[PDB]
Amino acid sequence: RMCKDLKHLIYYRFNTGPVGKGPGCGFWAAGWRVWLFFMRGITPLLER
RNA sequence: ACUCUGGUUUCUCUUCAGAUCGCAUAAAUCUUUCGCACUAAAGAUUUCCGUGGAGAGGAACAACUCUGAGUCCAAUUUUUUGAGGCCUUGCUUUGGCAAGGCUA
Ligand SMILES: O=P(O)(O)O[C@H]1[C@H](OP(=O)(O)O)[C@@H](OP(=O)(O)O)[C@H](OP(=O)(O)O)[C@@H](OP(=O)(O)O)[C@H]1OP(=O)(O)O
């Protein structure tokens, strides 16, 4: 849900101006952060 | 204005760290609370991601910038003079002292 949140955060700043709707936005650092912080927590679970 | 420290980088270990150890943020478990728990909150513990400090060990090139330490004044106002000489008493430790008056 959080990554979708960040998509809504990023796209609606990305798709302003002459940029319209479309699949061209990639500012991937926010979601990539979120999934790495998930990997931080489940690394010792899957390791155990 | 002459001389002796201390370096910096990197790899690793050990210990302390409730300090935004992290200008970022996970997960598990337990307990509590209400719902009726991914869509929910509290408290606590733990594990992870991965820090600062100190100590130690290796190995790479810099070695005295830095942090330190050991290492030109005679004219009013101070350090280039108002300084020296005479008289009375108390005692003379008979050398003279103390006070006052002087004279320059
Ligand atoms: O917000 P979501 O439910 O996750 O859906 C979004 C949304 O589509 P909808 O508006 O129809 O809901 C975006 O559109 P806008 O928010 O801009 O209006 C669209 O982005 P673009 O239209 O700008 O391309 C995006 O597509 P994507 O994330 O693939 O870029 C799409 O996500 P979905 O792929 O899940 O439909």
Swiss-Prot record:
Q: Which disease is it linked to?
A: Retinitis pigmentosa 13: A retinal dystrophy belonging to the group of pigmentary retinopathies. Retinitis pigmentosa is characterized by retinal pigment deposits visible on fundus examination and primary loss of rod photoreceptor cells followed by secondary loss of cone photoreceptors. Patients typically have night vision blindness and loss of midperipheral visual field. As their condition progresses, they lose their far peripheral visual field and eventually central vision as well.
Question: Any domain commentary?
Answer: The MPN (JAB/Mov34) domain mediates interaction with TSSC4 and SNRNP200. Has structural similarity with deubiquitinating enzymes, but lacks the residues that would bind the catalytic metal ion.
Protein localization: Nucleus; Nucleus speckle
Biological function: Plays a role in pre-mRNA splicing as core component of precatalytic, catalytic and postcatalytic spliceosomal complexes, both of the predominant U2-type spliceosome and the minor U12-type spliceosome. Functions as a scaffold that mediates the ordered assembly of spliceosomal proteins and snRNAs. Required for the assembly of the U4/U6-U5 tri-snRNP complex, a building block of the spliceosome. Functions as a scaffold that positions spliceosomal U2, U5 and U6 snRNAs at splice sites on pre-mRNA substrates, so that splicing can occur. Interacts with both the 5' and the 3' splice site.
User: What is the protein named?
Assistant: Pre-mRNA-processing-splicing factor 8
Q: How does it assemble?
A: Part of the U5 snRNP complex. Component of the U4/U6-U5 tri-snRNP complex composed of the U4, U6 and U5 snRNAs and at least PRPF3, PRPF4, PRPF6, PRPF8, PRPF31, SNRNP200, TXNL4A, SNRNP40, DDX23, CD2BP2, PPIH, SNU13, EFTUD2, SART1 and USP39. Component of the U5.U4atac/U6atac snRNP complexes in U12-dependent spliceosomes. Within the minor spliceosome, which acts on U12-type introns, interacts with PPIL2 and RBM48. Core component of U2-type precatalytic, catalytic and postcatalytic spliceosomal complexes. Found in a mRNA splicing-dependent exon junction complex (EJC) with SRRM1.
Q: Which residues cross the membrane?
A: none
**Shown residues within the full chain:** 603 to 650 of 2335
Q: What gene name is listed for this protein?
A: PRPF8
Task: Give expression by tissue.
Answer: Widely expressed.
